[PDB]
Design a protein around this ligand. Structure first.
Ligand SMILES: O=C1c2cccc3c2[C@@H](CCC3)CN1[C@@H]1CN2CCC1CC2
Ligand SMILES: O=C1c2cccc3c2[C@@H](CCC3)CN1[C@@H]1CN2CCC1CC2
Ligand SMILES: O=C1c2cccc3c2[C@@H](CCC3)CN1[C@@H]1CN2CCC1CC2
Ligand SMILES: O=C1c2cccc3c2[C@@H](CCC3)CN1[C@@H]1CN2CCC1CC2
Ligand SMILES: CC(=O)N[C@@H]1[C@@H](O)[C@H](O)[C@@H](CO)O[C@H]1O
Ligand SMILES: CC(=O)N[C@@H]1[C@@H](O)[C@H](O)[C@@H](CO)O[C@H]1O
Ligand SMILES: CC(=O)N[C@@H]1[C@@H](O)[C@H](O)[C@@H](CO)O[C@H]1O
Ligand SMILES: CC(=O)N[C@@H]1[C@@H](O)[C@H](O)[C@@H](CO)O[C@H]1O
Lengths: 205, 205, 205, 205, 205
């Protein structure tokens, strides 16, 4: 406990928090999705509710330490409130997102952080055709709300959404599920914005 | 990170927060709306739910800096809780507004601030006729709850509500959508109050 | 900004907060209602939902200042959390009251405070007869939860509820709406309690 | 204000906050219920919703003062967050309890505290027979979650639930309503736990 | 009070909080369930809601004391916010878990902590067959969200879920209810992970 208390103290009480990335010191955030269930489809409002886990990873020089200085501690867990986290948001949500898991991150001595919030999201999706063989496709994208591509870049480790924890007795069968990095330009802004587009095709039964 | 940490420290830890505008030092806030979806219409209570983004912009002398003094930083992102924000509210809401996006603002070296909260709002609207060709019109206005025109003035950059992110498969088609600055007088107060009236005409299909 | 910062500092950081009224220094609170809409009537549970604004006014010697000492500032706005506010509550609510407006008060150099929270309230009301010509009457009273008439007295400026912002396309037509000071005696306590009874008669169409 | 400010200051500065009772210094808490309405009955889930006020009273020697030392102040009001409160809870709730009143307590110069939260509670009750002449009986008990009878004892001033503010036009007529101190033994623990059982018999009309 | 105030001060104000377990100083958490009611079954979304109490127990050296040094105090109660608690969570929840009890723990002089949050949980379960004689079985597992078996080991004192507080008039009869420790290795990770699987078989009537 003593070494870990000392490490945490040195990292969090002896320097200011990371103020976030800039053009001169950009940050890459890696993002993948584990889809656990499609829990609700509402055809009168065109809303669909998912439960999923959002794997986020990034790295900061300010979170590095030498394990030999701290009794060979190579990683630790800490409340997400103790560290900077990126402002990744769903772009087509219809309700505030509901957090289903403790808000705790894993920090490793090379400065890398892993944060995996489980969440329920309501989003815009017309589910007409969900009860046919072809099913229906919807999409929702995730990205920084206020940082451009020049400050926060996103990547994925894979194009396939992790379906290995998908609820075996869901009302809905997943026909396809992809996660794809996209570069968007909007008319407002000259800077590109980066998102990951989660596209899920699904049907009943 | 070092220059940005120093800038933030100089701005936020070395003087009190801006106490808000007065008659002697008024403020102009620019306001525009991006309508993303009409998500619910309830004819038994005359409530309609929108999801929209509220672009807000204003400028403070107390947020200015010379980029040459701070490693050429010309702007940065910061939690909206670190700065004064204006008390703009919907005047005919029926439920507390639900915030859908991180509460983070962009501050620029000329002292200008941009804040773009995405929100779900329930408001008073009789939707009778929504299922006809003519559709139905409702309106909701937005302005400061407690500052008059002598302290906070509003303007818009345009009269047209931004419909470029409107959900392509909404239950509702937008026939018209305007945002108009208006001057209101209340019996309580001799000073005029300023609002922006969001008038949306829409129908099913 | 400098004068206002100095005033706020002198008022709030240089003495303790007002600890509330006592028998020796009672306080009069003025109370008036602006009824904006009857948003819901539920005959299966006997609940009715209103949206209204509650004008509250009181005066404290400890909030006085000479405008000549503070660059001629005669009033300012401040977060309701910076000041004492009275514990006025609805006595027949069925859900926590939902605040619809920013919680900001106006303080004037004579020590008077104006606070106007907009609210949605669910309360006990049997709406049988709402769909007839005679309509239906319900009532809900508002007063301090724990201060007796010896500490907090209530008055109204008028007996008529302000209907000038009542939603023109409500499901419900207001036949009558009054606000009336009353004295209540409880078996527990020898001291009378003061409330304002809001009585609204209404019907459909 | 001055004497009261001084009293509050002196009481805040006497010790840390009361750490709660122990075997060596137990505490008796007095408990009574005012039943305001039965607001909802759900026979598909066996839930019933009540609105009631929970009178709680206890006494601490550390909160005593001589009124002659403080300009004859014999009592004052203060936020419930400024003092220790007991952990009395409903034992068969199905939803978090909703607080309907300001969280303010009354402290008296003999060290007694009165706290009267108004609340809406959903709880386990099979309402079969509610629509007959005999009606239906349900029960919910209230006690400390973690203090045994050796640390917190409960009493009631009366066996009869106060029905004097029961809503005159409720869907439900109250046939009987009692509050009875009981001793419960759990298999986990050798110590008895004390609760007050609120038993309400009621029917429609 | 005096001795207890001194003990709490020595434990909580004189050293940092426990930073959680590591490979070098692991922790065992004991876990058991008291099932109070199955409150809702939804076959259109495959969600089931339970109300249960989650008994958690662990031990820390940093929470030990000699009772002779503190007026023979052998245990005390304290807000769960004063101490580290483990991040045990349901792995297939569909909603944020609702806490139904005060968040207070019992600490004993040997450093052991008992924490018993009562909760309402919605989780993934297909309730087809609930209305037959055989009934239906569902399952949900609980474990640390971020600590492996090398940091947090889980055990149960018994395989049987405590049914002694199960609501006598539930819609649902419990045919079987078990809690079983399971040790997993996943391909992603070299560390073993531990969960407790709560398996409940039930039917109507
Ligand atoms: O709409 C604007 C916008 C409009 C006019 C000026 C500016 C903007 C930028 C922020 C600075 C300058 C951000 N956004 C949105 C925030 N988020 C959602 C879409 C865009 C991009 C990412
Ligand atoms: O009702 C009052 C009011 C009443 C009596 C005195 C005063 C007021 C002002 C504040 C100044 C002094 C604010 N308001 C509301 C705030 N907002 C909504 C309606 C009005 C105007 C715009
Ligand atoms: O029940 C009591 C009560 C009981 C026993 C002692 C005392 C009380 C007072 C507070 C002082 C002393 C307030 N109340 C409630 C708070 N509010 C609503 C109902 C009553 C009256 C006004
Ligand atoms: O289950 C236990 C329990 C189990 C093993 C040890 C201990 C307990 C006590 C706390 C002290 C030591 C409290 N409780 C619950 C909390 N509350 C409700 C049910 C009981 C009784 C009162
Ligand atoms: C901190 C820094 O790099 N500042 C540069 C510096 O070259 C100069 O002040 C100017 C160009 O003359 O542009 C900027
Ligand atoms: C600081 C400031 O603005 N002061 C002036 C003051 O000189 C003048 O006497 C008053 C007129 O009544 O108006 C104001
Ligand atoms: C400050 C104050 O109120 N002091 C009063 C005093 O005038 C009175 O003589 C006494 C007995 O009644 O109680 C005390
Ligand atoms: C302050 C205090 O509690 N002192 C006690 C003492 O009186 C008692 O006889 C003994 C246990 O029997 O432990 C110690």
């Amino acid at each position: 406990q003593a070494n870990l208390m000392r490490l945490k103290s040195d990292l969090f009480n002896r320097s200011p928090m990371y103020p976030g990335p800039t053009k001169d010191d950009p940050l890459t955030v890696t993002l993948g999705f584990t889809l656990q269930d499609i829990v609700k489809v509402d055809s009168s409002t065109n809303e669909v509710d998912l439960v999923y886990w959002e794997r986020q990873r990034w790295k900061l020089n300010s979170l590095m330490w030498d394990p030999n200085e701290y009794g060979n501690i190579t990683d630790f867990r800490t409340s997400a409130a103790d560290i900077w986290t990126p402002d990744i948001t769903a772009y087509s949500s219809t309700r505030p997102v509901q957090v289903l898991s403790p808000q705790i991150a894993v920090v490793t001595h090379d400065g890398s952080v892993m944060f995996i919030p489980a969440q329920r999201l309501s989003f815009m999706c017309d589910p007409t055709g969900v009860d046919s063989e072809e099913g229906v496709t919807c999409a929702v994208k995730f990205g920084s709300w206020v940082y451009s591509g020049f400050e926060i870049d996103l990547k994925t480790d894979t194009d396939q959404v992790d379906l290995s924890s998908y609820y075996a007795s869901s009302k809905y069968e997943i026909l396809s599920a992809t996660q794809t990095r996209q570069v968007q330009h909007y008319s407002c802004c000259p800077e590109p914005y980066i998102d990951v587009n989660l596209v899920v095709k699904f049907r009943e039964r």
